[PDB]
Amino acid sequence: MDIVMTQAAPSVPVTPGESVSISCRSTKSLLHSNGNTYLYWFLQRPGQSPQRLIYYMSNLASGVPDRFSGRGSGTDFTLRISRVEAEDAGVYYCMQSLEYPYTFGGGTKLEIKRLVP
Amino acid sequence: QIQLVQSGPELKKPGETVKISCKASGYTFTNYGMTWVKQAPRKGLKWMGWINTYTGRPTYADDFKGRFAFSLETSASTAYLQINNLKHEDTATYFCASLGEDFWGQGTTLTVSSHHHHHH
Ligand code: NA
């Protein structure tokens, strides 16, 4: 039976330099007997391929800065971005790779809020 | 160092067939699998399946069983995705990835159009 991945919201608001959290839930625990938790976070900006931010639930991919972090247990996962910059705008997706078929969450658009002059 | 390069955009009429390539470079092709990902308008990212580039064995998500075929030309370090009998709902950008290594192609945008398929 497919593991369904769900993100709590389709977009979340933030202002420059402030922090934000994006959530993801699985229907089954992603912790394997080997001790790894088979959860990825990706970002996809428009016009680009997706790029991995986090692997094994909490490990930063190379080149990813220290302001990103991940936490969770079992079936509840949170990605945090601590000091948001323009370049962070995009859609964030969780994905499980514990069992076939691999499944993505629906994505959460990070929306940087600005006043209308 | 490492580059996955996909074939260019496709614009198609319903019922046609398309075949997209993904050529891998800068690592040993058969050491790592290739995954196919479908990026919609209004349906985020979908994992289509993956193919073992050493054995040739494919694993498909249930939703992609029927009209979709994964194949290889391993001597060319190339993986292919063929989509038969195109539907409007196949409109998307298709990515190849070596997901464990986080290598990504640039994407191939496929547009299935009843009345604009002739613009290229
Ligand atoms: Na399964």
Coordinates of C-alpha atoms and ligand atoms in Angstrom, one line a residue:
Chain A
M1 CA 0.0 0.0 0.0
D2 CA 1.4 3.4 -1.0
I3 CA 2.9 5.7 1.7
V4 CA 1.0 9.0 1.3
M5 CA 3.0 12.1 2.0
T6 CA 1.1 15.2 3.0
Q7 CA 2.2 18.8 3.5
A8 CA 0.2 20.9 6.0
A9 CA -0.2 23.9 3.7
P10 CA 0.2 24.8 0.0
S11 CA 2.0 28.0 0.8
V12 CA 3.5 29.8 3.8
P13 CA 4.2 33.5 4.3
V14 CA 7.5 35.0 5.5
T15 CA 9.3 38.4 5.4
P16 CA 12.9 38.8 4.6
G17 CA 15.5 37.9 7.2
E18 CA 12.9 36.0 9.4
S19 CA 12.5 32.3 9.9
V20 CA 9.8 29.9 8.7
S21 CA 8.8 26.2 9.1
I22 CA 7.3 23.8 6.6
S23 CA 5.7 20.6 7.7
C24 CA 5.2 17.1 6.2
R25 CA 3.4 13.9 7.5
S26 CA 3.7 10.3 6.3
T27 CA 1.1 7.6 6.9
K28 CA 3.8 5.1 7.9
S29 CA 7.0 5.5 9.9
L30 CA 10.0 6.3 7.6
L31 CA 12.5 4.9 10.1
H32 CA 14.1 1.8 8.8
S33 CA 15.6 -1.0 11.0
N34 CA 19.0 0.1 9.7
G35 CA 18.5 3.3 11.8
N36 CA 18.1 5.7 8.9
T37 CA 15.0 7.7 8.2
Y38 CA 14.1 7.7 4.6
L39 CA 12.9 11.3 4.1
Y40 CA 14.2 14.0 1.7
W41 CA 13.5 17.7 1.3
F42 CA 13.8 19.4 -2.0
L43 CA 13.4 23.0 -3.3
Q44 CA 12.3 23.8 -6.8
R45 CA 12.5 27.4 -8.0
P46 CA 10.7 28.3 -11.2
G47 CA 12.7 27.4 -14.3
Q48 CA 15.1 25.1 -12.4
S49 CA 15.3 21.4 -11.6
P50 CA 14.5 20.4 -8.0
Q51 CA 17.5 20.3 -5.7
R52 CA 18.0 18.4 -2.6
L53 CA 18.2 20.3 0.7
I54 CA 18.1 17.5 3.3
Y55 CA 18.6 13.7 3.2
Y56 CA 17.9 11.1 5.8
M57 CA 15.5 13.5 7.4
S58 CA 18.0 15.9 9.0
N59 CA 21.3 15.8 7.1
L60 CA 22.2 18.8 4.9
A61 CA 23.1 18.2 1.3
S62 CA 26.4 19.6 0.2
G63 CA 26.4 23.3 -0.7
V64 CA 23.3 23.9 1.5
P65 CA 23.7 26.5 4.1
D66 CA 23.5 26.2 7.8
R67 CA 20.2 28.2 8.1
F68 CA 18.3 25.2 6.8
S69 CA 17.6 22.3 9.2
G70 CA 15.3 19.4 9.5
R71 CA 13.7 17.5 12.4
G72 CA 11.1 14.8 13.0
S73 CA 10.1 11.4 14.3
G74 CA 8.5 8.6 12.5
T75 CA 5.7 10.2 10.6
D76 CA 6.0 14.0 11.4
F77 CA 8.7 16.1 9.8
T78 CA 9.6 19.8 9.8
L79 CA 12.0 21.8 7.7
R80 CA 13.1 25.2 9.2
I81 CA 14.7 28.1 7.5
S82 CA 16.2 30.5 10.0
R83 CA 16.9 33.7 8.2
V84 CA 15.0 33.8 4.9
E85 CA 16.5 35.3 1.8
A86 CA 15.1 36.1 -1.6
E87 CA 16.8 33.1 -3.2
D88 CA 14.8 30.8 -0.8
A89 CA 11.5 31.6 -2.5
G90 CA 10.3 28.5 -4.3
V91 CA 8.3 25.3 -3.7
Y92 CA 9.5 23.0 -1.0
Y93 CA 8.6 19.2 -1.2
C94 CA 9.2 16.3 1.1
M95 CA 9.7 12.8 -0.4
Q96 CA 9.9 9.3 1.1
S97 CA 12.1 6.6 -0.2
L98 CA 11.4 3.9 2.4
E99 CA 9.1 1.9 0.1
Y100 CA 8.1 1.8 -3.6
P101 CA 6.6 3.8 -5.0
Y102 CA 8.5 6.7 -3.7
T103 CA 6.1 9.5 -3.0
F104 CA 6.3 13.4 -2.7
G105 CA 4.2 15.6 -0.7
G106 CA 2.1 18.2 -2.5
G107 CA 4.6 21.0 -2.0
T108 CA 4.6 24.2 0.0
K109 CA 5.2 27.5 -1.8
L110 CA 7.4 29.9 0.3
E111 CA 6.0 33.4 -0.3
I112 CA 8.0 36.4 0.7
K113 CA 5.7 39.1 1.8
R114 CA 6.3 42.7 0.7
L115 CA 4.3 46.0 0.9
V116 CA 2.8 47.6 -2.2
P117 CA 4.4 51.1 -2.7
Chain B
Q1 CA 32.3 17.3 -13.2
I2 CA 28.8 15.7 -13.5
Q3 CA 26.0 16.5 -16.0
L4 CA 22.7 14.9 -16.9
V5 CA 21.5 16.5 -20.2
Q6 CA 18.0 15.9 -21.6
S7 CA 16.6 16.2 -25.0
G8 CA 14.7 19.4 -26.0
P9 CA 11.1 20.5 -25.5
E10 CA 8.3 18.5 -27.2
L11 CA 5.0 19.7 -28.5
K12 CA 2.6 17.0 -29.5
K13 CA -0.9 16.2 -30.6
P14 CA -3.0 13.9 -28.6
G15 CA -2.4 10.2 -29.5
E16 CA 1.1 10.7 -30.7
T17 CA 4.2 9.1 -29.1
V18 CA 7.2 10.9 -27.7
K19 CA 10.6 9.6 -26.6
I20 CA 12.8 11.7 -24.2
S21 CA 16.5 11.1 -23.6
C22 CA 18.7 11.7 -20.6
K23 CA 22.4 11.4 -21.2
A24 CA 24.6 11.1 -18.2
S25 CA 28.2 12.2 -18.0
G26 CA 31.1 12.4 -15.5
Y27 CA 30.5 9.3 -13.5
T28 CA 30.2 5.6 -14.2
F29 CA 26.6 5.3 -15.6
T30 CA 25.9 1.7 -14.4
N31 CA 26.9 2.4 -10.8
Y32 CA 23.7 4.4 -10.1
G33 CA 20.0 4.2 -11.1
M34 CA 18.0 6.7 -13.0
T35 CA 14.7 8.0 -11.7
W36 CA 12.0 9.8 -13.7
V37 CA 10.0 12.6 -12.2
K38 CA 6.9 14.3 -13.6
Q39 CA 6.4 18.0 -12.7
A40 CA 2.9 19.2 -13.4
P41 CA 1.0 22.5 -13.6
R42 CA -1.1 22.1 -10.4
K43 CA 0.2 18.6 -9.4
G44 CA 3.7 19.4 -8.0
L45 CA 6.2 16.5 -8.3
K46 CA 5.4 12.9 -9.1
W47 CA 7.8 9.9 -8.9
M48 CA 7.2 7.9 -12.1
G49 CA 9.7 5.1 -11.3
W50 CA 13.3 4.2 -11.7
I51 CA 15.5 1.9 -13.8
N52 CA 18.6 0.0 -12.7
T53 CA 21.2 1.0 -15.2
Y54 CA 23.3 -2.1 -14.4
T55 CA 20.6 -4.7 -14.8
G56 CA 18.1 -2.8 -16.9
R57 CA 15.3 -3.7 -14.6
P58 CA 12.6 -0.9 -14.2
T59 CA 10.3 -0.3 -11.3
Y60 CA 7.2 1.8 -12.1
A61 CA 4.7 3.6 -9.9
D62 CA 1.2 2.1 -10.5
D63 CA -0.1 5.4 -12.1
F64 CA 2.5 5.1 -14.8
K65 CA 1.9 1.5 -15.8
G66 CA 0.6 1.2 -19.4
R67 CA 1.7 4.0 -21.7
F68 CA 5.1 4.7 -20.2
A69 CA 8.4 2.9 -20.9
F70 CA 11.8 3.2 -19.4
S71 CA 14.8 2.0 -21.4
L72 CA 18.5 2.3 -21.8
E73 CA 21.3 2.5 -24.3
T74 CA 24.0 1.8 -21.7
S75 CA 27.0 2.2 -24.2
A76 CA 25.7 5.7 -24.8
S77 CA 25.2 6.4 -21.0
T78 CA 21.6 7.3 -22.0
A79 CA 18.3 6.6 -20.3
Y80 CA 15.0 7.1 -22.3
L81 CA 11.4 7.7 -21.3
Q82 CA 8.8 6.9 -24.0
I83 CA 5.2 8.0 -23.6
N84 CA 2.7 6.4 -25.9
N85 CA -0.7 7.6 -27.0
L86 CA -0.4 11.1 -25.5
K87 CA -3.2 12.6 -23.4
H88 CA -3.6 16.3 -22.4
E89 CA -2.8 15.3 -18.8
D90 CA 0.7 14.2 -19.9
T91 CA 1.5 17.9 -20.3
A92 CA 4.4 18.4 -17.9
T93 CA 8.1 18.9 -17.4
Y94 CA 9.9 15.5 -17.1
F95 CA 13.1 15.2 -15.2
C96 CA 15.7 12.4 -15.0
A97 CA 17.6 12.2 -11.7
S98 CA 20.2 10.0 -10.1
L99 CA 18.3 10.6 -7.0
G100 CA 20.7 9.1 -4.4
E101 CA 23.5 11.2 -5.8
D102 CA 21.2 14.2 -6.4
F103 CA 22.2 14.6 -10.1
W104 CA 19.3 16.2 -12.1
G105 CA 18.8 16.7 -15.7
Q106 CA 17.5 20.2 -16.8
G107 CA 14.0 18.8 -17.6
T108 CA 12.1 18.2 -20.8
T109 CA 8.9 20.2 -21.2
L110 CA 6.2 18.2 -23.0
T111 CA 3.1 20.0 -24.3
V112 CA 0.2 18.0 -25.7
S113 CA -2.0 20.4 -27.6
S114 CA -5.1 19.7 -29.7
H115 CA -4.7 22.9 -31.7
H116 CA -1.2 24.4 -31.2
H117 CA 0.9 21.3 -31.9
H118 CA 2.1 22.8 -35.1
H119 CA 4.2 25.6 -33.6
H120 CA 7.4 23.6 -33.8
Ligands
NA1 NA 4.6 -0.3 -1.6

